[PDB]
Amino acid sequence: YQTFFNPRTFGSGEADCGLRPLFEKKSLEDKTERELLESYI
Amino acid sequence: IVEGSDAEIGMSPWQVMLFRKSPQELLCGASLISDRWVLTAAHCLLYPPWDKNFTENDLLVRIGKHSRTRYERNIEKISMLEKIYIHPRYNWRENLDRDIALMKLKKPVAFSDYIHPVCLPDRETAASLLQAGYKGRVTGWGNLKEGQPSVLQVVNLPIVERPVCKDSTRIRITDNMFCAGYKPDEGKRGDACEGDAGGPFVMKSPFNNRWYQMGIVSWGEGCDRDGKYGFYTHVFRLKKWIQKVIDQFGE
DNA sequence: AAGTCCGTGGTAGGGCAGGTTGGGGTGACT
Ligand SMILES: Cn1c(CNc2ccc(C(=N)N)cc2)nc2cc(C(=O)N(CCC(=O)O)c3ccccn3)ccc21
Ligand SMILES: [Mg+2]
Ligand code: NA
């Protein structure tokens, strides 16, 4: 991922956006995300 | 959410609740895209046909919430709105074209296990994920059928072919919206409902494992009717407006 | 598949640009 906005106006958060502390950060998958993944095939 | 399930704790940490102060009621969903910017639907703040017209002081936002009711100490956070920006091309009468608003928090919110922003799509994520049959995730505390739920609901819905969207409604739809939901012949069901409007339609990239908000819950004829689909605001298409508002008026 | 359409009101002012707004894409239609 690469940033698009200026943190001064946008705020913090963009660098690490869309990665959940309790799932992606822990290498745990939620109970239905697999459904999404399988739809992209 | 109709035909959904209970969200797991921390499953949608960009979920935001948009409340009216007095009398206290849940108005809409919304999403956290940074420590101080929130995305929602324009009609949540301004919709003259329902004499809906809201200023910054009328509203409250609650973040990091699982249970609709009880206060969740050291988990949820309260915030006030500094300023609201509705898209100038928002059409509240004909077709809800460009149904999007940006909302600036009066102070930055701290991130946690329960509070974390969603990514905004770029051209390539739009090109890769916006395909008929590809599924995204809708979340909210709106009605379970056409009883508002105890805890946040989640359902996964396929993006639909454009010609089907168009034939599903008399409304003159535009390139600034898309539709999602199962067809009658697919057997499966599910949809957003009243109270889910303004919440995010998210999608997980198989390329970088990140969640992207591709859509905003905008409008639908009833909820979960056969031959009807939920309409979502096309976030990527409006990303330039987002950037301009944030550049021109941020912190 | 040569191309052509996506602004002057509309959701709405003062004006024919552009602004927080008429870009370019899941392009669509012929
Ligand atoms: C339900 N809902 C909401 C908000 N909550 C919401 C609820 C459910 C869903 C959902 N079912 N996923 C998604 C959002 N706003 C709505 C505006 C109209 C409406 O304005 N029009 C005219 C303009 C236009 O909508 O084009 C329209 C459409 C068909 C007929 C007549 N009128 C109908 C329904 C609306
Ligand atoms: Mg104009
Ligand atoms: Na449906």
Numbering used by the authors:
A (entry chain L): 1, 1A, 1B, 1C, 1D, 1E, 1F, 1G, ...
B (entry chain H): 16 to 36, 36A, 37 to 60, 60A, 60B, 60C, 60D, 60E, ...
Q: Could you share sentences copied from the article?
A:
We investigated whether an EXACT inhibitor against thrombin could be rationally created de novo by chemically conjugating the direct thrombin inhibitor dabigatran (DAB, Ki = 4.5 nM)13 to the DNA aptamer HD2214. The crystal structure of the HD22-thrombin complex indicates that the distance between HD22’s 5’ terminus and thrombin’s active site is ~40 Å15. Therefore, we extended HD22’s 5’ terminus with a poly-(7)-deoxyadenosine linker (estimated length of 49 Å)16 to facilitate the simultaneous binding of both the HD22 and the DAB moieties. DAB’s carboxyl group which is not directly involved in binding thrombin15 was then conjugated to the 5’ amino modifier at the terminal of the linker. The resulting EXACT inhibitor is named HD22-7A-DAB. The x-ray structure of thrombin complexed with HD22-7A-DAB at 2.2 Å resolution confirms the bivalent binding mechanism of HD22-7A-DAB. The diffraction data allows unambiguous placement of both aptamer and DAB moieties onto thrombin. The carboxyl group of DAB moiety is displaced from the reported thrombin-dabigatran complex possibly to accommodate the linker’s position. Only one deoxyadenine of the 7 nt linker at the 5’ terminus of HD22 is unambiguously resolved in the structure. At lower map contour levels, a partial second nucleotide is resolved, as is density potentially representing other nucleotides in the linker. These observations imply high flexibility of the linker, which presumably facilitates bivalent binding.
